[PDB]
Amino acid sequence: EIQFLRTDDEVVLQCTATIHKEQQKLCLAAEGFGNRLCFLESTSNSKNVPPDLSICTFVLEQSLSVRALQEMLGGGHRTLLYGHAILLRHSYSGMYLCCLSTSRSSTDKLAFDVGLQEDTTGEACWWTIHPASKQRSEGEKVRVGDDLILVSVSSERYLHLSYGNSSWHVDAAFQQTLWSVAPISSGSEAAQGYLIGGDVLRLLHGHMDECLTVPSGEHGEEQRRTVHYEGGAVSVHARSLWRLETLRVAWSGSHIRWGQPFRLRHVTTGKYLSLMEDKNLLLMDKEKADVKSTAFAFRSSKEKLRKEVDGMGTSEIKYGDSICYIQHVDTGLWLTYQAVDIQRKAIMHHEGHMDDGLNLSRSQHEESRTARVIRSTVFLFNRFIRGLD
Amino acid sequence: ANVVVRLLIRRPECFGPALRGEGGNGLLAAMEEAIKIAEDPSRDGPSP
Amino acid sequence: TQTGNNTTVNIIISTVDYLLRVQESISDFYWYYSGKDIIDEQGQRNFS
Amino acid sequence: KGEAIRIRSILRSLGDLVGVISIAFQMPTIAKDGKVVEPDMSAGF
Amino acid sequence: MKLSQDSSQIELLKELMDLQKDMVVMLLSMLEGNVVNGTIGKQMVDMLVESSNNVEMILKFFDMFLKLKDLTSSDTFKEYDPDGKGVISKRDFHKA
């Protein structure tokens, strides 16, 4: 019943460290657009601030042996083995996570930083996994939930969580650091038009081709969080697309069950969907998000009528063909619209309109890669111009 | 040489009496400290 | 099993572990020698 | 072409190690001596 | 693959094939009275599909009628022979 890591699997690295007599668990969030460096995401707290899984996801490429060095002188779904040279790639971008001749960081006079690049050239383009304690040897298959130690093939340095300015940083050094993995998603199963958690998708209507539309920044001074409705060119473009994040870290990129509580985040402005006490949405910011405020569930039917998931074989929900209704997990209110005398205000009614069905539209692979590209580009652009202004 | 340097570099053992943080081995300060504490005074700090 | 004995030792698992060790050693020797072309006499004796 | 590049880079990374020419330049001996004998040294570089 | 190209090393090849025969005998001895829906057979077939490439490499090179293949080299070698002592050249062997 045990599971073994294979090639082309989506994994995430967690580290545990001691500070102020309490236990902080962090994930390795790598950004490769505004900067080439890497930082740590504070995923230790989850009932206060939800972490982001868009940048901490990592997908394997191949499992090479240390003695299998071609130096320019894959059968398929290969298993992972201890003491093997593993390629660490990035999920949303083509950045290949490996060490280089970087010496920009001199906080400890001995530790280096690891960068991101597209070219898989030179010798420093692989990592080797090693067992933590003396219970696993080299040669056996790596199970799920065990501890792995990562060391570069050129610097011979481990991922050390050194303190530079009483903050969190990632440094390549010699201090042993415990690292773990989590099976976010598998490679054996594909999308094939079925719902996959963590993706980016749109919410359309039945026949009127109508969807949510956050306005532009013409009134962002005070009423930025206000939302409205628009149809036509917005539906065919990427304005009504959101990325859903599961609360749990393990198996986040799996099938989403009915009634699963999660939150919706805007991929253009960068805000979380939430409901306030005055029957108004007002969205939610990253620094002041709340689990109770940001909690949404997918209801199979309008009428009210096992928790851990490890096998994705249900596929009960389908893109487009399946019709689902959005409902809160605590208040139980339903999304409703009022035909005012084509912008409409979102008001959470109690009974809910019967003719208010929601259709799930997913950006296909022809445009979804483009979709992650544009959302990353606009995020970096707006953040950098705000920082400059 | 390979195994000797790997073992020596695997753990930091050279204490640094003038640097900060992990590692040490700062010649630019330790050599000056040695030549200012050994030339005029004796092997001890307080010495005629 | 060693039913009559108070402490049980599995010879089978030890033999399997030794087989795994010698298989790994032979595979590592092959991976080292994959770059060469001619067989040395010492290589012949070790292989035998 | 003999894998020594990695170990050479590692040794170079241990810059303070690059800037040891100034360390080699100094001459902290002071021969002292002079006219009235003054033999033997005990704390000479 | 490596020992087949070489010609001056025969004892090493003999020892390798002896080890191969012992290994396959040992594998065969595992299945003696297994049930039809037995776990031993399932584990064996899971092992076999893991090393699919190696088994493809060894099995599909067993049918060359010579050079560690099925003993059937005399299909056309005996058809063309001046005396039958097997002292023929290599060009007729290549065209055979």
Side-chain angles (χ1 to χ4, degrees), chain A residues 1-283 285-389, chain B residues 1-21 23-48, chain C, chain D, chain E residues 1-64 68 70-96:
Chain A
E1 54 94 21
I2 202 66
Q3 293 150 7
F4 288 144
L5 272 77
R6 311 267 188 179
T7 55
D8 312 299
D9 191 283
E10 273 204 280
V11 297
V12 61
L13 296 190
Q14 314 87 333
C15 52
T16 313
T18 70
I19 175 65
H20 297 140
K21 277 84 66 177
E22 43 93 40
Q23 284 313 68
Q24 208 168 341
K25 189 147 62 52
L26 307 175
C27 283
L28 190 72
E31 194 51 64
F33 229 83
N35 56 337
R36 288 298 197 258
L37 291 203
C38 176
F39 43 82
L40 287 155
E41 197 65 34
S42 302
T43 180
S44 82
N45 72 88
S46 169
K47 299 297 301 191
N48 185 34
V49 171
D52 46 29
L53 292 174
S54 58
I55 52 182
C56 315
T57 43
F58 286 99
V59 51
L60 316 180
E61 275 296 326
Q62 39 198 268
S63 169
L64 199 64
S65 312
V66 202
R67 276 271 165 194
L69 279 178
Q70 61 280 27
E71 203 63 32
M72 41 76 68
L73 289 178
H77 272 317
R78 305 300 306 167
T79 186
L80 179 55
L81 295 176
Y82 276 98
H84 265 87
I86 168 181
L87 188 50
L88 213 50
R89 202 176 65 88
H90 216 191
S91 176
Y92 86 122
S93 46
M95 280 316 187
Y96 279 86
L97 178 56
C98 61
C99 277
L100 284 172
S101 159
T102 51
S103 59
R104 199 62 184 272
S105 65
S106 87
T107 63
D108 297 344
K109 205 181 178 292
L110 187 136
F112 282 158
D113 278 345
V114 54
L116 293 154
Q117 72 270 18
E118 296 91 0
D119 46 315
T120 314
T121 58
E123 197 269 337
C125 46
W126 303 91
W127 294 74
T128 50
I129 52 171
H130 282 344
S133 57
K134 296 322 280 169
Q135 291 96 26
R136 304 292 194 275
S137 34
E138 282 91 357
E140 61 255 38
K141 295 176 176 65
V142 180
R143 60 198 85 260
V144 164
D146 50 354
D147 202 280
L148 329 181
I149 316 295
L150 277 306
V151 51
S152 157
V153 304
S154 72
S155 79
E156 305 92 29
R157 288 176 170 88
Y158 304 101
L159 316 177
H160 180 37
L161 278 81
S162 166
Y163 273 69
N165 44 359
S166 72
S167 62
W168 282 119
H169 277 94
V170 171
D171 289 327
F174 297 139
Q175 277 83 27
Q176 288 292 328
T177 302
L178 284 307
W179 284 97
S180 174
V181 294
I184 283 178
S185 174
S186 163
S188 80
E189 55 94 18
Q192 308 285 341
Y194 304 71
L195 171 83
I196 288 294
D199 78 318
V200 196
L201 77 185
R202 313 193 173 104
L203 325 162
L204 291 182
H205 284 174
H207 271 260
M208 51 155 48
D209 301 328
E210 197 61 32
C211 52
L212 270 300
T213 304
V214 162
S216 62
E218 78 266 17
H219 54 77
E221 292 87 5
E222 191 61 47
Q223 52 268 16
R224 163 80 268 180
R225 330 283 277 274
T226 53
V227 311
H228 78 281
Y229 258 72
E230 218 283 338
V234 162
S235 87
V236 73
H237 292 357
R239 285 180 70 162
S240 63
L241 79 171
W242 299 273
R243 184 175 181 269
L244 56 95
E245 291 86 4
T246 313
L247 313 184
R248 69 211 184 102
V249 185
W251 294 109
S252 164
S254 58
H255 296 348
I256 291 299
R257 285 268 73 78
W258 304 104
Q260 197 151 354
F262 49 83
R263 57 196 91 213
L264 273 77
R265 190 201 187 178
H266 214 279
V267 296
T268 298
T269 46
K271 290 164 202 327
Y272 288 86
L273 206 61
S274 77
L275 176 59
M276 311 285 78
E277 53 256 33
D278 59 338
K279 308 294 181 182
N280 292 309
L281 297 176
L282 162 54
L283 280 153
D285 277 350
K286 180 70 176 294
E287 327 91 294
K288 52 175 198 64
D290 270 304
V291 170
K292 182 78 60 153
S293 76
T294 72
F296 291 82
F298 264 60
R299 286 288 188 273
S300 57
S301 180
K302 187 59 84 150
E303 52 100 23
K304 200 73 167 174
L305 191 140
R306 190 218 190 188
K307 303 298 184 195
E308 187 61 77
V309 181
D310 297 312
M312 321 317 152
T314 51
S315 88
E316 298 164 345
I317 178 163
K318 189 67 174 66
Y319 278 134
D321 297 355
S322 87
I323 304 298
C324 182
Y325 324 118
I326 169 66
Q327 200 213 20
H328 287 282
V329 79
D330 46 353
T331 71
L333 304 168
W334 308 83
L335 265 299
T336 47
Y337 69 104
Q338 49 269 37
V340 301
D341 192 37
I342 51 175
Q343 307 178 358
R344 280 90 59 84
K345 186 62 178 176
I347 286 299
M348 305 298 306
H349 282 158
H350 289 64
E351 52 98 24
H353 271 85
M354 190 23 47
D355 310 333
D356 213 0
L358 268 302
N359 206 332
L360 302 180
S361 159
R362 178 255 175 162
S363 277
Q364 315 297 320
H365 296 104
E366 195 268 330
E367 65 268 15
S368 76
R369 333 331 314 156
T370 82
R372 51 97 179 173
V373 164
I374 35 172
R375 62 92 182 177
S376 87
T377 326
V378 299
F379 268 20
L380 265 300
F381 210 43
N382 61 60
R383 276 295 312 128
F384 261 60
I385 65 191
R386 282 302 105 83
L388 191 59
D389 286 332
Chain B
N2 282 352
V3 287
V4 164
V5 73
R6 256 66 158 271
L7 284 167
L8 195 141
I9 289 304
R10 180 68 71 190
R11 67 200 79 208
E13 81 258 19
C14 177
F15 59 96
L19 288 188
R20 54 102 176 173
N25 207 128
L27 256 283
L28 194 61
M31 172 57 109
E32 279 71 4
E33 173 174 53
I35 67 175
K36 72 105 178 178
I37 209 166
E39 195 268 331
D40 177 74
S42 168
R43 283 96 182 156
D44 202 44
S47 286
Chain C
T1 63
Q2 289 111 325
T3 88
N5 199 4
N6 48 14
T7 313
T8 72
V9 182
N10 208 333
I11 308 298
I12 309 289
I13 309 300
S14 313
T15 308
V16 168
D17 288 0
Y18 180 74
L19 181 61
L20 181 62
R21 285 212 273 125
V22 297
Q23 175 264 297
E24 276 183 357
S25 194
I26 290 163
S27 84
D28 286 329
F29 206 80
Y30 150 72
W31 270 118
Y32 157 76
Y33 220 90
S34 177
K36 301 201 205 313
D37 58 328
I38 193 65
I39 288 323
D40 196 74
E41 198 70 37
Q42 304 295 109
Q44 268 178 356
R45 291 211 217 84
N46 296 2
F47 270 139
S48 67
Chain D
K1 44 221 162 304
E3 200 258 341
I5 321 90
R6 298 210 290 111
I7 193 51
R8 269 192 100 206
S9 75
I10 289 299
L11 260 70
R12 278 180 171 145
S13 80
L14 275 311
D16 201 355
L17 202 58
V18 177
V20 294
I21 309 100
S22 49
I23 299 291
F25 273 167
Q26 67 193 0
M27 172 36 78
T29 43
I30 302 103
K32 296 182 178 68
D33 58 81
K35 212 255 179 182
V36 189
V37 197
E38 197 167 357
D40 209 348
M41 291 335 307
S42 167
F45 188 78
Chain E
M1 283 336 162
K2 196 186 274 270
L3 272 301
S4 45
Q5 307 284 281
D6 301 309
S7 56
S8 55
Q9 313 162 6
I10 308 300
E11 324 298 309
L12 197 52
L13 213 29
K14 292 274 175 85
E15 286 154 21
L16 260 289
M17 309 286 208
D18 279 2
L19 191 63
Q20 177 76 45
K21 186 213 298 190
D22 278 299
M23 204 212 63
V24 299
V25 162
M26 191 285 258
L27 273 186
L28 201 53
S29 299
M30 194 84 45
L31 328 167
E32 268 205 344
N34 61 324
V35 201
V36 161
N37 266 7
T39 77
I40 313 164
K42 198 175 300 309
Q43 274 172 2
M44 181 95 78
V45 79
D46 281 326
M47 171 285 258
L48 270 175
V49 300
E50 265 176 38
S51 294
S52 179
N53 209 338
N54 313 334
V55 169
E56 290 324 294
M57 203 159 348
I58 57 176
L59 269 182
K60 91 182 150 204
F61 283 30
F62 259 126
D63 206 28
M64 328 189 161
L68 316 164
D70 45 346
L71 191 48
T72 172
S73 301
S74 54
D75 292 344
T76 179
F77 171 71
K78 277 197 284 187
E79 265 188 20
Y80 162 66
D81 47 332
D83 193 21
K85 297 294 183 182
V87 291
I88 74 159
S89 79
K90 273 191 259 289
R91 299 307 108 211
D92 47 353
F93 176 73
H94 195 187
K95 84 174 166 59

mmCIF file of all heavy atoms in Angstrom, chain A residues 109-110 123 153-157, chain D residues 6 9-10 13-17:
data_model
loop_
_atom_site.group_PDB
_atom_site.id
_atom_site.type_symbol
_atom_site.label_atom_id
_atom_site.label_comp_id
_atom_site.label_asym_id
_atom_site.label_seq_id
_atom_site.Cartn_x
_atom_site.Cartn_y
_atom_site.Cartn_z
ATOM 1 N N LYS A 109 30.414 34.304 4.612
ATOM 2 C CA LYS A 109 31.745 34.205 4.013
ATOM 3 C C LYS A 109 32.030 32.818 3.438
ATOM 4 O O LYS A 109 33.085 32.620 2.823
ATOM 5 C CB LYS A 109 32.857 34.589 5.005
ATOM 6 C CG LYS A 109 34.154 35.083 4.375
ATOM 7 C CD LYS A 109 35.189 35.405 5.440
ATOM 8 C CE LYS A 109 36.501 35.848 4.818
ATOM 9 N NZ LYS A 109 37.176 34.728 4.106
ATOM 10 N N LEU A 110 31.120 31.859 3.595
ATOM 11 C CA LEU A 110 31.326 30.505 3.096
ATOM 12 C C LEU A 110 30.129 29.938 2.347
ATOM 13 O O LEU A 110 30.319 29.044 1.513
ATOM 14 C CB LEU A 110 31.684 29.563 4.260
ATOM 15 C CG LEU A 110 32.113 28.119 3.987
ATOM 16 C CD1 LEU A 110 33.312 27.755 4.846
ATOM 17 C CD2 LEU A 110 30.965 27.152 4.245
ATOM 18 N N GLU A 123 28.663 20.932 -15.576
ATOM 19 C CA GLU A 123 28.592 19.832 -14.624
ATOM 20 C C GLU A 123 27.602 20.094 -13.499
ATOM 21 O O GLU A 123 26.992 19.148 -12.987
ATOM 22 C CB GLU A 123 29.981 19.559 -14.039
ATOM 23 C CG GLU A 123 30.134 18.209 -13.357
ATOM 24 C CD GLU A 123 29.817 18.263 -11.877
ATOM 25 O OE1 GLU A 123 29.912 19.361 -11.288
ATOM 26 O OE2 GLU A 123 29.477 17.209 -11.301
ATOM 27 N N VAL A 153 26.260 18.682 -6.812
ATOM 28 C CA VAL A 153 27.334 17.859 -7.360
ATOM 29 C C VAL A 153 28.610 18.643 -7.623
ATOM 30 O O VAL A 153 29.640 18.034 -7.954
ATOM 31 C CB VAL A 153 26.899 17.170 -8.669
ATOM 32 C CG1 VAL A 153 25.639 16.356 -8.445
ATOM 33 C CG2 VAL A 153 26.688 18.202 -9.761
ATOM 34 N N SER A 154 28.583 19.964 -7.491
ATOM 35 C CA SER A 154 29.769 20.782 -7.714
ATOM 36 C C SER A 154 30.231 21.520 -6.471
ATOM 37 O O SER A 154 31.437 21.657 -6.254
ATOM 38 C CB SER A 154 29.512 21.797 -8.834
ATOM 39 O OG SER A 154 28.635 22.818 -8.396
ATOM 40 N N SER A 155 29.305 22.006 -5.649
ATOM 41 C CA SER A 155 29.669 22.709 -4.428
ATOM 42 C C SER A 155 29.712 21.801 -3.209
ATOM 43 O O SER A 155 30.312 22.183 -2.197
ATOM 44 C CB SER A 155 28.688 23.855 -4.169
ATOM 45 O OG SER A 155 27.484 23.373 -3.600
ATOM 46 N N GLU A 156 29.102 20.614 -3.290
ATOM 47 C CA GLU A 156 29.024 19.669 -2.173
ATOM 48 C C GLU A 156 28.430 20.329 -0.932
ATOM 49 O O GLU A 156 28.890 20.122 0.191
ATOM 50 C CB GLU A 156 30.393 19.061 -1.863
ATOM 51 C CG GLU A 156 31.062 18.401 -3.050
ATOM 52 C CD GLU A 156 31.976 19.350 -3.795
ATOM 53 O OE1 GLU A 156 32.516 20.278 -3.157
ATOM 54 O OE2 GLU A 156 32.153 19.169 -5.017
ATOM 55 N N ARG A 157 27.395 21.133 -1.142
ATOM 56 C CA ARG A 157 26.791 21.925 -0.083
ATOM 57 C C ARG A 157 25.321 21.566 0.061
ATOM 58 O O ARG A 157 24.632 21.311 -0.930
ATOM 59 C CB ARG A 157 26.950 23.420 -0.367
ATOM 60 C CG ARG A 157 28.371 23.916 -0.181
ATOM 61 C CD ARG A 157 28.524 25.374 -0.561
ATOM 62 N NE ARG A 157 29.826 25.899 -0.167
ATOM 63 C CZ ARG A 157 30.915 25.846 -0.922
ATOM 64 N NH1 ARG A 157 30.902 25.278 -2.117
ATOM 65 N NH2 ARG A 157 32.046 26.375 -0.465
ATOM 66 N N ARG D 6 36.853 21.283 -10.184
ATOM 67 C CA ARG D 6 35.933 21.427 -9.058
ATOM 68 C C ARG D 6 36.687 21.647 -7.752
ATOM 69 O O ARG D 6 36.345 22.539 -6.968
ATOM 70 C CB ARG D 6 35.033 20.195 -8.959
ATOM 71 C CG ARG D 6 34.145 19.977 -10.172
ATOM 72 C CD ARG D 6 32.848 19.291 -9.784
ATOM 73 N NE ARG D 6 33.062 17.903 -9.394
ATOM 74 C CZ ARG D 6 32.914 17.443 -8.160
ATOM 75 N NH1 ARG D 6 32.566 18.239 -7.163
ATOM 76 N NH2 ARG D 6 33.122 16.152 -7.920
ATOM 77 N N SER D 9 38.274 25.090 -7.684
ATOM 78 C CA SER D 9 37.283 26.111 -7.365
ATOM 79 C C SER D 9 36.921 26.086 -5.885
ATOM 80 O O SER D 9 36.744 27.143 -5.265
ATOM 81 C CB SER D 9 36.036 25.917 -8.227
ATOM 82 O OG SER D 9 35.266 24.820 -7.767
ATOM 83 N N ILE D 10 36.808 24.888 -5.303
ATOM 84 C CA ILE D 10 36.511 24.774 -3.878
ATOM 85 C C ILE D 10 37.624 25.399 -3.047
ATOM 86 O O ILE D 10 37.364 26.176 -2.121
ATOM 87 C CB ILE D 10 36.282 23.300 -3.495
ATOM 88 C CG1 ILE D 10 34.959 22.793 -4.072
ATOM 89 C CG2 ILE D 10 36.312 23.127 -1.984
ATOM 90 C CD1 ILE D 10 33.746 23.537 -3.565
ATOM 91 N N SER D 13 37.485 29.073 -3.210
ATOM 92 C CA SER D 13 36.379 29.652 -2.458
ATOM 93 C C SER D 13 36.717 29.870 -0.989
ATOM 94 O O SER D 13 36.132 30.759 -0.361
ATOM 95 C CB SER D 13 35.139 28.766 -2.583
ATOM 96 O OG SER D 13 35.210 27.657 -1.704
ATOM 97 N N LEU D 14 37.634 29.089 -0.426
ATOM 98 C CA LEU D 14 38.072 29.317 0.949
ATOM 99 C C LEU D 14 38.892 30.599 1.043
ATOM 100 O O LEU D 14 38.960 31.227 2.099
ATOM 101 C CB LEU D 14 38.888 28.133 1.479
ATOM 102 C CG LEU D 14 38.147 26.940 2.095
ATOM 103 C CD1 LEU D 14 37.126 27.414 3.119
ATOM 104 C CD2 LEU D 14 37.489 26.065 1.046
ATOM 105 N N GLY D 15 38.639 38.323 -2.259
ATOM 106 C CA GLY D 15 38.587 37.289 -1.243
ATOM 107 C C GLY D 15 39.752 37.342 -0.275
ATOM 108 O O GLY D 15 40.836 37.812 -0.623
ATOM 109 N N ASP D 16 39.519 36.864 0.951
ATOM 110 C CA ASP D 16 40.581 36.842 1.953
ATOM 111 C C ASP D 16 41.720 35.923 1.530
ATOM 112 O O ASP D 16 42.897 36.274 1.682
ATOM 113 C CB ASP D 16 40.016 36.410 3.306
ATOM 114 C CG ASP D 16 40.897 36.829 4.468
ATOM 115 O OD1 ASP D 16 41.994 37.372 4.224
ATOM 116 O OD2 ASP D 16 40.492 36.611 5.630
ATOM 117 N N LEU D 17 41.390 34.744 0.999
ATOM 118 C CA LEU D 17 42.429 33.836 0.525
ATOM 119 C C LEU D 17 43.134 34.396 -0.704
ATOM 120 O O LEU D 17 44.344 34.200 -0.870
ATOM 121 C CB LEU D 17 41.831 32.463 0.223
ATOM 122 C CG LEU D 17 42.832 31.305 0.241
ATOM 123 C CD1 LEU D 17 43.525 31.221 1.590
ATOM 124 C CD2 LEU D 17 42.144 29.996 -0.086
#
